[PDB]
UniProtKB/Swiss-Prot annotation:
GO CC terms in record: axon; cell surface; dendrite; early endosome; endoplasmic reticulum lumen; endosome; endosome membrane; Golgi apparatus
Name of the gene this protein is made from: BACE1
Main EC class the enzyme belongs to: hydrolase
Organism field: Homo sapiens
Residue ranges that the UniProt entry lists as topological domain Extracellular: 38-377
Active site: 220
UniProt protein name: Beta-secretase 1
Keywords from the named record: Acetylation, Aspartyl protease, Cell membrane, Cell projection, Cytoplasmic vesicle, Disulfide bond, Endoplasmic reticulum, Endosome, Glycoprotein, Golgi apparatus, Hydrolase, Isopeptide bond, Lipoprotein, Lysosome, Membrane, Palmitate, Phosphoprotein, Protease, Signal, Transmembrane, Transmembrane helix, Ubl conjugation, Zymogen
Length: 377
């Protein structure tokens, strides 16, 4: 019955992926961004210039006020509002209704996006990072507690205006090819994983692997970019610059600020390297790699110019809070958040990114000694 959830996600490039949900009685329909990088379910509940619609608690007979405030500061953007509970369903999801915590957003700053078609966010990570504290049960925990939906979900995020699937409660085998490779969830707060090796065009970055996970590494569907700790970011940009020095790039391109364009169909993909991320595996001394194409880390953006060229922004950003495997890493992979078994699986997606002579891959097994030394603490 997972077929009912295939293609249940939509979005705009750089702006997240959202699924349709209803809250309250009678049901109020809202588009909700799916975010494995946080743990609060929150919806616009007051007018805002960028909201097409919002949750009206007054109109729901099943609304309950928790008489408690809340706020969430993300890496960029924040909101504040009022806690309460209500009945929640996912029309293209399992056939259930659950009473869940909901933060009614009453003020926000740089959270909602102009012209955006989503009105709220579904934090799919664990209670440990829920605001105001870990006693506010996250939506997925309520779903599993109140129904027989199995304790896992999977995400197929597709590039090119974007779509994909969130399969709630399982794995749909028609959405990926090849084998699923699993990496442990190190700790249940973020979806934290451990990266044990990095290569660019087959060349090892050769850093202390602790640097790759300083101070954590997470899988985060609510962040567009690959974000890398300062030292890793610099090494990676240096290597990518070198590989592509054939061409010249504007100022701020490598900062993700300025875009670069080529005549339509002439993007020199070949001079941009693949990036391989090796992840800790399920058995001793064993890892696997996912290989990322430049078509993933050069994000397509519309040309505000009179030209109809292919333009892109560099979708790798420097971080001061650890590695973030964002949407452009997840795109073209099928990612299984197996909460029940505390692991995350990766396989080549059915909607994989295409390149003339290279392909995104998930490959294993590899041997990697002393993998536990890669985790930060
Ligand atoms: C809440 C706690 C646990 C917390 C605190 C700090 C970091 C984290 C790690 N997860 C972050 C996500 O939950 C959050 C999700 C988000 C969605 C929509 C708007 C804003 C944030 N995303 C971000 O903060 C990102 C930082 C880089 C710029 C990102 C921008 C380009 C802006 N962005 C917004 C729309 C979705 C795609 C996107 O890329 C947002 C978690």
């Amino acid at each position: 019955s997972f077929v009912e959830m295939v293609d249940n996600l939509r979005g705009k490039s750089g702006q997240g992926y959202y699924v349709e949900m209803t809250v309250g009685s009678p049901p109020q329909t809202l588009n909700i961004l799916v975010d494995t990088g946080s743990s609060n379910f929150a919806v616009g509940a007051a007018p805002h210039p960028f909201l097409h619609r919002y949750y009206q608690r007054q109109l729901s007979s099943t609304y309950r006020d928790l008489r408690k405030g809340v706020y969430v500061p993300y890496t960029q953007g924040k909101w504040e509002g009022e806690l309460g509970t209500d009945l929640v369903s996912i029309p293209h999801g399992p056939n259930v209704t659950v009473r869940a915590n909901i933060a009614a957003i009453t003020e926000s700053d740089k959270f909602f996006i102009n012209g955006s078609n989503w009105e709220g966010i579904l934090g799919l990570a664990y209670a440990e990072i829920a605001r105001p504290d870990d006693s506010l049960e996250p939506f997925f925990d309520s779903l599993v507690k109140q129904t027989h939906v199995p304790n896992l979900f999977s995400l197929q995020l597709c590039g090119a205006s974007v779509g994909g699937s969130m399969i709630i409660g399982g794995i749909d085998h028609s959405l990926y090819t090849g084998s699923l490779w699993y990496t442990p969830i190190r700790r249940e707060w973020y979806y934290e994983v451990i990266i044990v090796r990095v290569e660019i065009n087959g060349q090892d970055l050769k850093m202390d692997c602790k640097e790759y996970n300083y101070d954590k590494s997470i899988v985060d569907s609510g962040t567009t970019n690959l974000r890398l700790p300062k030292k890793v970011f610099e090494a990676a940009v240096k290597s990518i610059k070198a590989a592509s020095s054939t061409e010249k790039f504007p100022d701020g391109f490598w900062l993700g600020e300025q875009l670069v364009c080529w005549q339509a169909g002439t993007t020199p993909w070949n001079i941009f390297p693949v990036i391989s991320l090796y992840l800790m595996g399920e058995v001793t001394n064993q890892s696997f790699r996912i290989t990322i194409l430049p078509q993933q880390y050069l994000r397509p953006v519309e040309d505000v110019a009179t030209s109809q060229d292919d333009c892109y922004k560099f979708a790798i950003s420097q971080s001061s809070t650890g590695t973030v495997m964002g949407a452009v890493i997840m795109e073209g992979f099928y990612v299984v958040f197996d909460r029940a078994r505390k692991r995350i699986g990766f396989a080549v997606s059915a909607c994989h990114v295409h390149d003339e002579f290279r392909t995104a891959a998930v490959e294993g097994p590899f041997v990697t000694l002393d993998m536990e030394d890669c985790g930060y603490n």
